[PDB]
Design an enzyme around this catalytic site. Structure first.
Site, PDB file in Angstrom:
ATOM      1  N   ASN A  46      35.448  27.714  38.338  1.00 33.43           N
ATOM      2  CA  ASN A  46      36.127  28.097  37.333  1.00 33.43           C
ATOM      3  C   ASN A  46      37.304  27.759  36.943  1.00 33.43           C
ATOM      4  OD1 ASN A  46      35.372  31.636  39.177  1.00 33.43           O
ATOM      5  ND2 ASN A  46      34.415  30.718  36.647  1.00 33.43           N
ATOM      6  N   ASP A  48      40.457  28.229  37.120  1.00 34.20           N
ATOM      7  CA  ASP A  48      41.313  28.864  37.264  1.00 34.20           C
ATOM      8  C   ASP A  48      41.212  27.728  38.579  1.00 34.20           C
ATOM      9  OD1 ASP A  48      39.444  30.308  39.293  1.00 34.20           O
ATOM     10  OD2 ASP A  48      40.781  32.062  38.934  1.00 34.20           O
ATOM     11  N   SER A  50      39.061  29.089  41.318  1.00 35.42           N
ATOM     12  CA  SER A  50      37.927  29.608  41.983  1.00 35.42           C
ATOM     13  C   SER A  50      36.297  29.573  41.485  1.00 35.42           C
ATOM     14  CB  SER A  50      38.196  31.079  41.074  1.00 35.42           C
ATOM     15  OG  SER A  50      38.315  31.299  40.395  1.00 35.42           O
ATOM     16  N   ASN A  59      32.562  35.810  42.465  1.00 40.67           N
ATOM     17  CA  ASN A  59      34.163  34.965  42.308  1.00 40.67           C
ATOM     18  C   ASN A  59      34.534  34.965  44.363  1.00 40.67           C
ATOM     19  OD1 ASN A  59      36.974  34.567  41.213  1.00 40.67           O
ATOM     20  ND2 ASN A  59      35.379  33.685  40.577  1.00 40.67           N
ATOM     21  N   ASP A 101      34.253  49.204  40.884  1.00 43.45           N
ATOM     22  CA  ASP A 101      35.596  48.640  41.629  1.00 43.45           C
ATOM     23  C   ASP A 101      36.437  49.414  40.078  1.00 43.45           C
ATOM     24  OD1 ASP A 101      36.041  47.274  39.244  1.00 43.45           O
ATOM     25  OD2 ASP A 101      36.116  45.680  40.849  1.00 43.45           O
TER      26      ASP A 101
END
Ligand SMILES: [Cl-]
Length: 129
Positions: A46, A48, A50, A59, A101
Site C-alpha cells: 500500500n 502507507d 503497509s 493488511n 469489527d
C-alpha cells in the site's frame, strides 16, 4: 497455492464462512477472486508502507505483524507470512475478526466495488458443497 473456484468455496464452507455474520459463501469467493485471483501467495504494498497478504489481502497496518509496518496493530496475533499458507485456516480466522469489527465486508475494497449488489451466488454455481 492457486485455488479453483469450487475448491475454495468448499474450503471456506468447511471453515465456517457460509453465512458468517450474514454473508453467503458467494460473497467470500467473489472477494477472494478480485483480492488475490484465488492465490494464497498474493502480496501487494500500500501507499502507507503497509502490505496486504494472502487470499483475502489482509493488511499489516491492523491485522498481522510483518516486522516492517511501524506503529501497526497485530489484531489477529499472527505473522503476515501465516496468511500466505496453502492452508487458509489463518486467513479465514482473521477474516472472521475483520468482518465482525463493525463495517462487515466493506473492509475489502474489491468486495465493495466488484461484488456488493451483484449476483454473488454465481460464484458457487455448479459446485458440490
Ligand atoms: Cl454487515
Amino acid at each position: 497455492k492457486v485455488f479453483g473456484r469450487c475448491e475454495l468455496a468448499a474450503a471456506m464452507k468447511r471453515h465456517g464462512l457460509d453465512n458468517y455474520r450474514g454473508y453467503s459463501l458467494g460473497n467470500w469467493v467473489c472477494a477472494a477472486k478480485f483480492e488475490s485471483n484465488f492465490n494464497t501467495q498474493a502480496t501487494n504494498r500500500n501507499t502507507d508502507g503497509s502490505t496486504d497478504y494472502g487470499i483475502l489481502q489482509i493488511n499489516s497496518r491492523w491485522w498481522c505483524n510483518d516486522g516492517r509496518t511501524p506503529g501497526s496493530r497485530n489484531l489477529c496475533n499472527i505473522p503476515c507470512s501465516a496468511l500466505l499458507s496453502s492452508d487458509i485456516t489463518a486467513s479465514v480466522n482473521c477474516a472472521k475478526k475483520i468482518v465482525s469489527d463493525g463495517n462487515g465486508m466493506n473492509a475489502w475494497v474489491a468486495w465493495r466495488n466488484r461484488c456488493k449488489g451483484t449476483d454473488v451466488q454465481a460464484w458457487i454455481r455448479g459446485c458440490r458443497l
